[PDB]
Structures are given as structure tokens and as C-alpha cells.
Design a protein around this motif. Structure first.
Motif, short mmCIF file in Angstrom:
data_model
loop_
_atom_site.label_atom_id
_atom_site.label_comp_id
_atom_site.label_asym_id
_atom_site.label_seq_id
_atom_site.Cartn_x
_atom_site.Cartn_y
_atom_site.Cartn_z
N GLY A 118 18.58 -45.60 -58.88
CA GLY A 118 18.14 -46.18 -57.55
C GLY A 118 19.59 -46.95 -57.00
N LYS A 119 19.71 -47.22 -55.62
CA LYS A 119 20.98 -47.89 -55.20
C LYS A 119 20.60 -48.58 -53.85
N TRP A 120 21.35 -49.55 -53.53
CA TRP A 120 21.09 -50.11 -52.41
C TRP A 120 22.31 -49.38 -51.54
N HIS A 121 21.75 -48.86 -50.29
CA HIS A 121 22.47 -47.96 -49.46
C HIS A 121 22.76 -48.80 -48.08
N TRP A 160 20.05 -52.53 -44.43
CA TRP A 160 20.00 -52.21 -46.18
C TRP A 160 18.92 -51.21 -46.29
N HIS A 161 19.13 -50.00 -47.08
CA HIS A 161 17.88 -49.11 -47.35
C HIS A 161 17.89 -48.86 -48.89
N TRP A 162 16.91 -49.27 -49.50
CA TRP A 162 16.69 -49.15 -50.91
C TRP A 162 16.60 -47.55 -51.19
N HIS A 163 17.31 -46.88 -52.03
CA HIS A 163 16.83 -45.43 -52.42
C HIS A 163 16.37 -45.52 -53.75
N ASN A 164 15.15 -45.15 -53.89
CA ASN A 164 14.62 -44.99 -55.21
C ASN A 164 15.34 -43.90 -56.19
#
Ligand SMILES: [Cu+2]
Ligand SMILES: [Cu+2]
Ligand code: NA
Ligand code: NA
Ligand code: NA
Ligand code: NA
Lengths: 12, 12
Positions: A7-10, B2-6
Motif C-alpha cells: 500500500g502507498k500514499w499517492h 491524497w489517495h491511499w492505494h491498498n
């Protein structure tokens, strides 16, 4: 094979 | 914004 993607912050 | 990617299992 399988690949775990963390997972990451994009920033959009 | 911001967009959290799981994290995920990615089949290659
Ligand atoms: Cu992958
Ligand atoms: Cu994103
Ligand atoms: Na992996
Ligand atoms: Na990737
Ligand atoms: Na989000
Ligand atoms: Na995406």
C-alpha cells in the motif's frame, strides 16, 4: 509469479 | 488530493 504490491500514499 | 492505494496481490 505472485508480486505483493505494498500500500502507498499517492499524491494526485 | 491524497489517495491511499491498498496493498494487493498482483499476479504476474
Ligand atoms: Cu506486480
Ligand atoms: Cu492514486
Ligand atoms: Na513480491
Ligand atoms: Na507495479
Ligand atoms: Na483515498
Ligand atoms: Na491507481
Amino acid at each position: 509469479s505472485w508480486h505483493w504490491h505494498n500500500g502507498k500514499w499517492h499524491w494526485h
